[PDB]
Amino acid sequence: MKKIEAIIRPFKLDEVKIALVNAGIVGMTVSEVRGFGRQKGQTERYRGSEYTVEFLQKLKLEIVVEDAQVDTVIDKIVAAARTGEIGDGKIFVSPVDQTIRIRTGEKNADAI
Amino acid sequence: MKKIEAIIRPFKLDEVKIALVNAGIVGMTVSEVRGFGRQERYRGSEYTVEFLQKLKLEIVVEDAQVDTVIDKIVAAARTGEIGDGKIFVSPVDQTIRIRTGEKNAD
Amino acid sequence: MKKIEAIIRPFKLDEVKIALVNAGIVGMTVSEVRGFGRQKGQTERYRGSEYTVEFLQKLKLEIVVEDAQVDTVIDKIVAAARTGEIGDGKIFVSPVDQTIRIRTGEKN
Amino acid sequence: MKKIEAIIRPFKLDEVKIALVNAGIVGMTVSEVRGFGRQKGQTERYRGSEYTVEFLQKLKLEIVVEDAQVDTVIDKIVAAARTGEIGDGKIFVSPVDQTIRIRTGEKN
Amino acid sequence: MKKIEAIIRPFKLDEVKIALVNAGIVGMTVSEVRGFGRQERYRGSEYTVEFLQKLKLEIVVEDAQVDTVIDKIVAAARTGEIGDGKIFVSPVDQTIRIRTGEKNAD
Amino acid sequence: MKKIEAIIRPFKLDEVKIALVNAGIVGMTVSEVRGFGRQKGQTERYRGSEYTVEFLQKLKLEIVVEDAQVDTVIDKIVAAARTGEIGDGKIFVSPVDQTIRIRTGEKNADAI
Amino acid sequence: SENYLNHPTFGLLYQICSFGDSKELFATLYAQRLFFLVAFDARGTRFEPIGRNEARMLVDNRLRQLRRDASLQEYNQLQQVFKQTFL
Amino acid sequence: SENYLNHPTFGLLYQICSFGDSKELFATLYAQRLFFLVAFDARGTRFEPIGRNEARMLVDNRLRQLRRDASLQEYNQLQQVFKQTFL
Amino acid sequence: SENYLNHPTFGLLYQICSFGDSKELFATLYAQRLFFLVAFDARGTRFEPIGRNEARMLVDNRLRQLRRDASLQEYNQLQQVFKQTFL
Amino acid sequence: SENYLNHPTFGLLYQICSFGDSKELFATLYAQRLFFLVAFDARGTREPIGRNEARMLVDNRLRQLRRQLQQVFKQTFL
Amino acid sequence: SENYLNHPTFGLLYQICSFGDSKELFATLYAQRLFFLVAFDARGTREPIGRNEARMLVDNRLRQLRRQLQQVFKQTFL
Amino acid sequence: SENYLNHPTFGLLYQICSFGDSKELFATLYAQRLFFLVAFDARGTRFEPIGRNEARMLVDNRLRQLRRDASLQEYNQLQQVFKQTFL
């Protein structure tokens, strides 16, 4: 059982959420992060002075899935989230030993 | 050595914190997240909210302690009705302390 | 391939960022967290009433690196981030099965 | 190199243009003129009073061509523009020393 | 055989036309042009005009007739003060009549 | 003595006029013409229906100059009138036997 | 019978037919192609544009009604006959 | 003072006199001869045609009035313009 | 009914009760403990801090008033929320 | 984009800019200089304005003027 | 051009379009859906509007929106 | 003494110094670099931005006035001396 972290452009949340919900991936959690590089600078101004920004607003989707579903879930997110030009983001897949649900106590795991 | 991520209802922090502190779990870190669900008005217009304010507790513990730490968090954090949250247990290779350089591993 | 989570003092970001950039570690992501817990020295005011704070503003750097680079990347971060007195923070190293780039589809 | 001025009946423009385009004569310019003078048949009304018109609306085509092409270009225009009855117009052929294109500077 | 272009004051057309018709010059063509000069108001704002309405008479004649035709036009068209205009004489290789095909040349 | 006909884009008149006036070329006459080709079509519309235009509004400058001045006067007009893209126009140089001034009777000519 | 007219935008217009009285249909000579329904108000001298399908229709029904005009037929017949009668 | 003006049908028009105001009389240069009473609405430059006898009369009483105040001088210009337009 | 809110200094705040209206009481989640009287101007969401004794009192008389009409039920929720916030 | 237009008095006019939507500003080519606020209409293509007026109008157009969305619109409202 | 903004209640907001000049329209990312008309200010970055209002505002911006001159300006007025 | 603060656009801000009372200077952590002159009104909690040259100047004169503050000197001296006195 594995965790998919997807750092994506914030406005893409809805498009991603839909894709994941169509894949029957109901359990996702989102956090606000900033990513490096920057990619592109910039220019920019705010009102005298003018400035450059190295850390751009991105969103981190976390979902956990079965090992079989990963390849699919990845492909769907990619399709949903990508926009051609730089800053599209990246996806990290990592392992998870078990998940427990607080309301009921239900332990899940597809590994022994 | 393993990491316990607990997504919980924000107001439950104190009750959880106490439980963990009673289990002698002093090293925890908290972040603000939003979780999916469904499951209102503000002042004209009225709206629906898909992503609800939750809190993510991260703590790292020894393999033996996990089962206990989990049970204690569950007891602390649960409230019967939906939205209670979930707990993810994942591995950790090593931890280092910045002030001293102390590695804990295996 | 492994993930380095570094909880650090927020103002140290720039000093850390530079160190990592000098180690050619271009791909890092930062989030705002609060850490526990004592811790010590806390007892303050804000203007009647006065209060104590158990959860202090910290920053969480996430970067992913090759297994060889870990030991180095760790040492560089430590040097950059430490300030002697308590509250300096901690670093967690954990595994990662694969990384994919959204723009291109490149698996590492 | 020579210039062909053709004073013609305005409605014949399209028929002429086509003929010239079929002769691969792409560079033509048109202006609005009035020709003299009798001429005959003129005596009209417009609505009390009634009047006579000595200068009738015609169109002046200007094109420039190589000396060899003249005889052909003339015959084609004539065929295109003529309508049997008076007022058909006339064609003037005159010399041209050089032509220059503004966009490029090309002298012919 | 030569072409006479006469840029003249528009109101002088009739006086010129008559002169030319008395010289038996039946084939003339007229176009509307603007000439350079300098040399007023409309209703707020007020303005200056560099290009003044003039008329361009084109006629073609035999080489012998030129000197006469010129003198007659001048007499007809002139008005003493500036803006009277100018006359250009240029060559013409041949003329053809569209209705019949009649070439006049040399 | 020669005549320079310059078919140009109408809005360039002022820029051309200035150039010519700086060359001390005071005697110029302008007429409104339409040129072929078109170059470019088009697209265009007016208000239902939509249409294509083969003959575009241009202006014809006529000036007469001495044989020596031609090469200069041409270069100046070109510089003034050109705009890089198609539709810039063309310049025709042709001979003139004599010019007479109506007000005075002054005959000019630089050929015998 | 040739009749031309200056539009302020599209320049010279040429007469297609009448509409009739007291309006005439005109078309663009320099553009290919736009149509106008002209009339004299007359402050005045108006212009109102119409699409080609409309124009094409208007000319059709004029074309019909003209065919059975006396003077038109009267000429068209005098033509057919004139030669064999005199020539 | 020469002033010309484009009619959309009859082309260039030349000024006979002013009255004016703000309202003057114009005549056809290419046609012999039609007259127009031009004004600025404006909101468009107004054109309205008048017969030669009307025009003749209007120039007459203008011709008179210049004697009555703004002579003369101007009397001669318009009385000449009278000669070369009707006589 | 859970409702949270971000303070710019003290971060996340949790709702203690409403009064409300259109004006409710919030407390610090990360700090132990500061209270705020929040409202919507708005024109910006208003924040104004109050000491715990004030907050304590305000919750008391709210606690009472729910007995007086909108009980109870809601009386228990807020009297529990009273216990776990001061007691 | 070149656009010309014939005034009955001052002859050919050249386009300075578009004030709509529907209106467009034109200026005299042969005279230096008069400005017109053209529209159509009607029923007869339609008014003169002083240069200071014109200068102002071009300014605020110039501001406007220097100076994806559909996708959002579809995402937000559709 | 992505631009985000934190609302104190509804958290992160994403930019729909620019209504000035100075104003810009934003929408809730976590809630579906609320709209805000942002400006600054002040002295404290500054107001909510219903979706029908928002939908309208985007429309007329959309019109405006789809949709040399300096050279003319210099030629005409300078 | 670390103090952080959330800007609604530029996110987290870090404290440079005070201005002082009752205002503090803050700078962008994620951007490089923008400065803000913060104060509590307090509806409220305001933000007003200032250019770096201003900021740089403000820190300078604070830096000066701080050098000759009793507690600062009192510490800086106790430091110089502490070792040789005790250590």
PDB file of C-alpha atoms in Angstrom, chain D residues 2 5 7 32-36 54-55 60 74 78 81-82 84-86 88-95, chain E residues 3 13 17 21 26-32 56 58 60 91-101 103:
ATOM      1  CA  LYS D   2       5.923  51.628 -70.796  1.00  0.00           C
ATOM      2  CA  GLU D   5      -3.385  54.420 -69.092  1.00  0.00           C
ATOM      3  CA  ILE D   7      -9.902  55.288 -69.359  1.00  0.00           C
ATOM      4  CA  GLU D  32     -11.773  57.935 -60.518  1.00  0.00           C
ATOM      5  CA  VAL D  33     -11.966  60.483 -63.348  1.00  0.00           C
ATOM      6  CA  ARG D  34     -14.549  62.242 -65.507  1.00  0.00           C
ATOM      7  CA  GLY D  35     -14.281  62.367 -69.312  1.00  0.00           C
ATOM      8  CA  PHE D  36     -15.646  64.836 -71.928  1.00  0.00           C
ATOM      9  CA  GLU D  54     -20.800  67.112 -69.889  1.00  0.00           C
ATOM     10  CA  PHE D  55     -18.368  65.106 -67.723  1.00  0.00           C
ATOM     11  CA  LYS D  60      -8.505  55.323 -65.087  1.00  0.00           C
ATOM     12  CA  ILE D  74      -3.755  46.521 -75.266  1.00  0.00           C
ATOM     13  CA  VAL D  78      -9.911  46.503 -75.620  1.00  0.00           C
ATOM     14  CA  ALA D  81     -13.692  46.978 -71.995  1.00  0.00           C
ATOM     15  CA  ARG D  82     -15.543  47.669 -75.263  1.00  0.00           C
ATOM     16  CA  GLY D  84     -20.027  48.856 -79.058  1.00  0.00           C
ATOM     17  CA  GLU D  85     -21.718  52.200 -78.385  1.00  0.00           C
ATOM     18  CA  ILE D  86     -20.004  55.560 -77.685  1.00  0.00           C
ATOM     19  CA  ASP D  88     -16.162  53.152 -74.405  1.00  0.00           C
ATOM     20  CA  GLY D  89     -13.044  55.238 -73.783  1.00  0.00           C
ATOM     21  CA  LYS D  90      -9.437  55.359 -74.880  1.00  0.00           C
ATOM     22  CA  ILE D  91      -5.982  54.004 -74.062  1.00  0.00           C
ATOM     23  CA  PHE D  92      -2.749  56.001 -73.779  1.00  0.00           C
ATOM     24  CA  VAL D  93       0.678  54.386 -73.985  1.00  0.00           C
ATOM     25  CA  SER D  94       3.625  56.391 -72.638  1.00  0.00           C
ATOM     26  CA  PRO D  95       7.243  55.698 -71.641  1.00  0.00           C
TER      27      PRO D  95
ATOM     28  CA  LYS E   3       0.213  64.746 -73.158  1.00  0.00           C
ATOM     29  CA  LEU E  13     -12.826  74.165 -65.522  1.00  0.00           C
ATOM     30  CA  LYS E  17     -13.070  73.703 -71.326  1.00  0.00           C
ATOM     31  CA  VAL E  21     -13.237  73.412 -77.307  1.00  0.00           C
ATOM     32  CA  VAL E  26     -12.526  67.604 -77.861  1.00  0.00           C
ATOM     33  CA  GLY E  27     -10.795  64.764 -75.973  1.00  0.00           C
ATOM     34  CA  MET E  28     -10.055  65.811 -72.389  1.00  0.00           C
ATOM     35  CA  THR E  29     -10.268  63.971 -69.087  1.00  0.00           C
ATOM     36  CA  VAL E  30     -10.492  65.531 -65.594  1.00  0.00           C
ATOM     37  CA  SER E  31      -9.530  64.194 -62.151  1.00  0.00           C
ATOM     38  CA  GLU E  32      -9.709  65.545 -58.611  1.00  0.00           C
ATOM     39  CA  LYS E  56      -6.098  67.801 -63.136  1.00  0.00           C
ATOM     40  CA  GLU E  58      -5.344  65.559 -69.101  1.00  0.00           C
ATOM     41  CA  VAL E  60      -3.263  64.561 -75.621  1.00  0.00           C
ATOM     42  CA  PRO E  91       5.455  62.308 -74.445  1.00  0.00           C
ATOM     43  CA  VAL E  92       2.983  59.659 -75.622  1.00  0.00           C
ATOM     44  CA  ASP E  93       3.865  56.756 -77.938  1.00  0.00           C
ATOM     45  CA  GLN E  94       0.404  55.881 -79.165  1.00  0.00           C
ATOM     46  CA  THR E  95      -3.292  56.278 -78.454  1.00  0.00           C
ATOM     47  CA  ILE E  96      -5.938  53.683 -79.199  1.00  0.00           C
ATOM     48  CA  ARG E  97      -9.717  54.122 -79.288  1.00  0.00           C
ATOM     49  CA  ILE E  98     -11.617  51.285 -77.646  1.00  0.00           C
ATOM     50  CA  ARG E  99     -14.821  51.501 -79.719  1.00  0.00           C
ATOM     51  CA  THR E 100     -13.043  51.206 -83.093  1.00  0.00           C
ATOM     52  CA  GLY E 101      -9.373  50.241 -82.502  1.00  0.00           C
ATOM     53  CA  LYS E 103      -4.225  53.869 -83.469  1.00  0.00           C
TER      54      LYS E 103
END
